[PDB]
User: Fold this.
Amino acid sequence: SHMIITDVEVRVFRTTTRRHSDSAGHAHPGPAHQVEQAMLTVRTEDGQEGHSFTAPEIVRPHVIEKFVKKVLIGEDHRDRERLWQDLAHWQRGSAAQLTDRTLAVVDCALWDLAGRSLGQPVYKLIGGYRDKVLAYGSIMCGDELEGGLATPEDYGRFAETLVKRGYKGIKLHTWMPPVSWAPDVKMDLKACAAVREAVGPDIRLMIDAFHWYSRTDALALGRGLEKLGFDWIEEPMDEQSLSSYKWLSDNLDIPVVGPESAAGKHWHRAEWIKAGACDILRTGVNDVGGITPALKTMHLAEAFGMECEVHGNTAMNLHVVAATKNCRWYERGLLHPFLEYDDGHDYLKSLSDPMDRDGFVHVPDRPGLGEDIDFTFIDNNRVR
Amino acid sequence: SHMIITDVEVRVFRTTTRRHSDSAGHAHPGPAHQVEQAMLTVRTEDGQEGHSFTAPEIVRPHVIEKFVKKVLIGEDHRDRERLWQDLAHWQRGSAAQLTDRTLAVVDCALWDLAGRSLGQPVYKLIGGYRDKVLAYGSIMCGDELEGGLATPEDYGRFAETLVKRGYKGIKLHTWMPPVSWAPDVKMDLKACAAVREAVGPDIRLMIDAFHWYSRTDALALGRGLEKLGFDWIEEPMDEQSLSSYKWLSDNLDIPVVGPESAAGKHWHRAEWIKAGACDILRTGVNDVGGITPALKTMHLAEAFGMECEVHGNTAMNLHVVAATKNCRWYERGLLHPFLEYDDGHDYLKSLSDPMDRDGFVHVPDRPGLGEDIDFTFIDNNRVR
Ligand SMILES: [Cl-]
Ligand SMILES: [Cl-]
Ligand SMILES: [Cl-]
Ligand SMILES: [Cl-]
Ligand SMILES: [Cl-]
Ligand SMILES: [Cl-]
Ligand SMILES: [Cl-]
Ligand SMILES: [Cl-]
Ligand SMILES: [Mg+2]
Ligand SMILES: [Mg+2]
Ligand SMILES: [Mg+2]
Ligand SMILES: [Mg+2]
Ligand SMILES: [Mg+2]
Ligand SMILES: [Mg+2]
Ligand code: NA
Ligand code: NA
Ligand code: NA
Ligand code: NA
Assistant:
C-alpha cells in the first residue's frame, strides 16, 4: 500500500516578481511586488511526494475539500487515467467551480509524484522523443511604456535582441484593451512589418493578436501578414465561434493555429479538426486540463498528420513537447525588454527550461517534472 | 549509461500446441504438434532485459541486422517515441520487409524493458484506468469437425459453455475458405441465430464473418443480424475499401466496428473516423505496430467520443485495455470446444489473462508486460 495517496496539501507563499496582469488578464512588466503563488503537494503512504504550481484560487479550500481530496485520498497514485476521468466526471455538476485549471494542477502533481518516486523525468516515463527542442521567443502583449512595447519600432528592436540571444522563431502578442487605443489592425500590422524588417526573411515569425477581432478585421489582419511571410496567425477571433475559424482559414493563405483557449479539452479539439477550423492544432497543459489530456491532443493531431503547438512555458509543457514529435516549438516566455527571463523564479533553484546560444531548450535531467524547488524559500515566505 | 541498449537477441524455440492455421491463416484445432516461436530480448548496459514474443519470420536475421539493431543499439531504451518513429521512417524503403508486425514486437519489448527495469506493470506506467476488465469469448473460425464448429447448432452449444464459464459477451468467427462450402451468408446467420437462441437476450453477441464479402452479401448479413440484437458486425468486407464501409454503415442499423487489418496504423484510422466508415473504431498492438501507436489510436477515438475495441489477446493488448477507458472489452481467445484456453502456454508459468467466474480478466501484478516467462523451458526447447 506504499503507492496509496495519503495527503493532498496546498501551500500558499509569496513570490517577488515584476510581472503584473491587467484587468483583462494580459501580462505586463511593472513595479517589483509580491504575488501569492500556490504549490499543490500529493503524498503517498511511503512518504513520496509530487508537486505542481498554480494560482491560489485554483486550489483554494473549497475545491480541495469538495473535489480533489474525495477523488485522490486512498487511491493508487499511478491510476492517472482513472483519477483524471473521475475529476472530469464531476466538473459538470460543480457549479462551475471545478475547472480545467484545477484538473491540470492535480494531473501535473500526479505525474511529478510518479517521476520522483521512480527517479525518472516525466518525458522519459511517457516515452521520450527529444532531449532538446527549438524554442520561440514569445513576446508579451503590447503596452504604452516608453521603450517597452509601445510602438511598432519597439517590437522591431526587441526582436533584434531575441535573435542575438539565439531564438530561431519569434511570436508577437500585439496591443489589446485596456491599452487606451487598442485594438488596431493597422498598428498590429506595422509591428509585424517592423519585426520582419529587423530580423530578415530566415527567422520564423508568428502573431497572436487581439483575441476577439471581428471576421472582417481578422481577414484584414491575415491578408496583411501574407505579404510578410509569417508562419502562423493565432487566435485572432473569439474561439467560441468555430464557424468563424472555418471561414477565416478558407479565406487566408497563412496557417491558422488553434484553438488555444476554447473549452472542451481533447474532445473539442477533435471538432476543430473534423470541421477544418484550423491548419495547425493547439493545446496546452493548462488549457486542456493536464499532461494526460495534452498528450491525447498531441496523438489526435498526429493521426491526422497535423502539428499541435503547445501553449505556455514551464516544465509541464516542456515535458509534453519533449515526449512528442509533431510540435515545432516550445513556447518560451512571455518576454519583454524590461525583464530578464533567464533569471528564473525566486522559488526555483534553477531554470526548468535553460536555452543554449543556438535556440535549443534542454530538458533538465531531474526526476518528475524536474522543477528544482526551493522548499526553504517557500517555507520562509508562507502566506499566514 | 546504464539505460543504453547493448544487445538485441532472438531466441527461437518449439512450443507444443494443438493450434494450427489453414492456408488462409485462420486458426483451427488439430493434432498436438511443435510450432516454432520466437522471443525478442532487448538488454541494456546494466543487464536489465525486456522480452516479447512473435513468429520467427517477423524477427528473422535479415530484419534484425538490417533494421532493428541499427535503430536500437547504443540508444536510451526509454526514448520509445524516437525509436518507434525511426523504425516507422525506414518501412517505406525496406522492400516490404520491415513490417508493422516487426515494429510491434520491438515496441513491446521496449515497454517490457522499461517496466521490468522500474518494477512496474506496463499499464501502471502508462497511467492505469482499470485493474480488471470484462472479456468476451472470441470463438475460432468455423470448421468441418464433427462436434466442433461444423454446424449452426455447434456454435449454440459452445456458446452455452462459454456463458457458464462466465463470459458476458461472445463473438463468433464464422466459416471461411478453405472450408469447402464457405462462405455462405445464410449459414453465418443460422449460427448467429442459434447462439442468440441458446444464450438469451442479455448476453452481448458479436460477429466477425468472412472478411471479403461483397457489398450485397454484407448488406444481407447485416440486415439479418438486426433481427438478433447483435452488438456489432466486424470486418465483413475487404477493409482496403474505405468507401464500402461508408456505404455499409450508412445502410445498416447494427454498429460496424473497424478497421482491424487495414494498414496505415493510427493515421489510417483517423481517416476511418473522418469519413464515417465505422461506428466503433478498432485497433490492436499487432495491427498498428505496437503499444505506442495502439495508445495513440485509443486517444484518437476518445477525442471523437468513440470506443476503440482492441484486437487480440495476450499481455500486450491487455495492458492497452487496462490503461484506457473507451474500450468495452478484452478479447479472450480464440476459443474452441476441443481446446482448453485456461491451460495457457507451455513457455509461460502462469496466465497473462486469468479470468474470474464473473467474466472479468485481472491484470497480473507483475512488472513490464507481466508475462511469466519459463526461461528454462525455452532453453530446453531451442531450435538449433
Ligand atoms: Cl475557499
Ligand atoms: Cl528575455
Ligand atoms: Cl538560459
Ligand atoms: Cl530546499
Ligand atoms: Cl534471414
Ligand atoms: Cl475455452
Ligand atoms: Cl483463468
Ligand atoms: Cl525460468
Ligand atoms: Mg496564444
Ligand atoms: Mg487557409
Ligand atoms: Mg531561481
Ligand atoms: Mg476480427
Ligand atoms: Mg449504420
Ligand atoms: Mg504454462
Ligand atoms: Na490572439
Ligand atoms: Na480550413
Ligand atoms: Na470479418
Ligand atoms: Na457511417
